[PDB]
Ligand binder design. Structure first.
Ligand SMILES: O=C(O)CNC(=O)C(=O)O
Ligand SMILES: [Mg+2]
Ligand code: NI
Ligand SMILES: [Zn+2]
Length: 331
C-alpha cells in the first residue's frame, strides 16, 4: 500500500504532466497521496495563473465576515458577523492596519504558536465565498474555472443527467482568519490555489481516521452534537494541534505559499488559518473514486448547514433514502 503513514505529499509536475488534470489526480492517488487527505502541487516554472495582480482592487466583497470566537484557546467555535461591503483595495488596507496586521515573528512555527495562543482574543474579517475567478481565460492548464463539472462526472459514471452548476469561489484573508474543521459538501474533493499574498497553514486528518476526529468533536462540543448528528457541517468548530495530539488524533500540517495548489481528498477533514493579507480561489470537483464517498456522506438536516442549489441533485440521486429529511432541513 502506498503512503501507509498518510503523510502529506508534495508534487512537482512537468509542463507536460500539467496538461491533463484528471490524469495527474489519478497519478497522485497511485502514489498514495489521498491517504493524507491533502496534497500540495507546485506548478511547473513555465506556468502562470494570469499576467499580474495589479488590477484587482475594485473587486467587491459584498458581505465581509467578522469571525468572533467563543471558548478556550485550543477548543473554540466562531460565528460570522456580517459587515458592510468593501472593495478588495479597502480590505487590503484594513488587513495591513495596526489593529489587524500580522505581528512580528521569527518563522512560520513562531507564527503558528502565536495563532493558537491568541486567536480567540481577536475578531479578524474574512472575505469568503465570493463567486468568481482570477485565472486568465487563456490559461489552459489547471484553470479552476475550466474544470470538468461534477454534474458531468455523475452523468458519465452513473448515466443520470442532472441540473446544477459548479463555479469557483474567491477568498480574501487577513491574519488570523480561520477555516473551521470540515469535509467538503457531499465529501467532494476541493482544489485551492493561493493567488497572492501571505501563506495559509493547513491541518488535515487522513480520511481513514475521520471518525476519530468526529468522536473527539462530539466530546468537545457536547451541546452542538446533541443539536445535530453532523454538526461539523456547520463549519464553526476549531480544535488545536496540541488538543488533537493530547487525544491521540492522527493529523498532519503544512503551509501553502502563493503560487501553490492544494487538493483536499474525499472525507479529508481540514482546518487552518491565514498568515496575513491574501487571496485564494477554490472549487469542488469529483472523480470516479468520489462516487462511493458521496453515497456515504453525512448530512446536516437541522437547518444550520444550508448549502448550494447543486447539492440537491447529489443527495437526490446518491442518497434517496435521506433526501426527504435533508430537503426539510433546506426549507
Ligand atoms: O481557504 C479557505 O478559507 C478554505 N478553503 C477550503 O476549505 C478548501 O479549499 O477546501
Ligand atoms: Mg478590480
Ligand atoms: Ni474545504
Ligand atoms: Zn446541523
Amino acid at each position: 500500500a502506498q503512503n501507509p503513514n498518510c503523510n502529506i505529499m508534495i508534487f512537482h509536475p512537468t509542463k507536460e504532466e500539467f496538461n491533463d488534470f484528471d490524469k495527474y489526480i489519478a497519478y497522485m492517488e497511485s502514489q498514495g497521496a489521498h491517504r493524507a487527505g491533502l496534497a500540495k502541487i507546485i506548478p511547473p516554472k513555465e506556468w502562470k495563473a494570469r499576467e499580474t495582480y495589479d488590477n484587482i482592487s475594485e473587486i467587491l466583497i459584498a458581505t465581509p465576515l467578522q469571525q468572533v470566537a467563543s471558548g478556550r484557546a485550543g477548543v473554540f467555535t466562531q460565528y460570522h458577523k456580517k459587515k458592510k461591503a468593501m472593495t478588495v483595495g479597502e480590505y487590503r488596507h484594513l488587513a495591513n492596519s495596526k489593529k489587524y496586521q500580522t505581528p512580528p515573528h521569527q518563522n512560520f512555527e513562531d507564527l503558528e504558536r502565536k495563532y493558537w495562543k491568541n486567536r480567540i482574543y481577536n475578531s479578524p474579517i474574512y472575505g469568503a465565498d465570493i463567486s468568481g475567478s482570477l485565472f486568465d481565460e487563456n490559461t489552459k492548464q489547471w484553470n479552476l474555472g475550466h474544470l470538468g463539472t461534477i454534474q458531468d462526472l455523475l452523468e458519465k459514471e452513473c448515466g443520470v443527467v442532472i441540473e446544477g452548476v459548479n463555479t469557483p469561489y474567491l477568498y480574501f484573508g487577513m491574519w488570523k482568519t480561520t477555516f473551521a474543521w470540515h469535509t467538503e459538501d457531499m465529501d467532494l474533493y476541493s482544489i485551492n490555489y493561493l493567488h497572492l499574498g501571505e501563506p495559509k497553514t493547513w491541518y488535515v486528518v487522513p480520511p481513514e481516521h475521520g471518525q476519530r476526529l468526529e468522536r473527539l468533536a462530539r466530546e468537545l462540543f457536547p451541546g452542538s452534537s446533541r443539536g445535530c448528528g453532523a454538526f461539523l457541517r456547520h463549519k464553526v468548530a476549531l480544535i488545536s494541534p496540541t488538543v488533537l495530539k493530547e487525544n491521540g488524533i492522527p493529523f498532519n500540517r503544512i503551509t501553502q505559499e502563493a503560487g501553490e495548489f492544494m487538493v483536499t481528498f474525499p472525507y479529508g477533514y481540514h482546518a487552518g488559518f491565514n498568515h496575513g493579507f491574501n487571496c485564494a480561489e477554490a472549487i469542488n470537483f469529483a472523480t470516479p473514486r468520489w462516487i462511493d464517498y458521496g453515497k456515504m456522506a453525512s448530512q446536516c438536516s437541522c437547518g444550520e448547514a444550508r448549502v448550494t442549489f447543486s447539492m440537491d441533485a447529489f443527495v437526490r440521486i446518491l442518497q434517496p433514502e435521506r433526501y426527504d429529511l435533508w430537503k426539510r432541513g433546506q426549507d
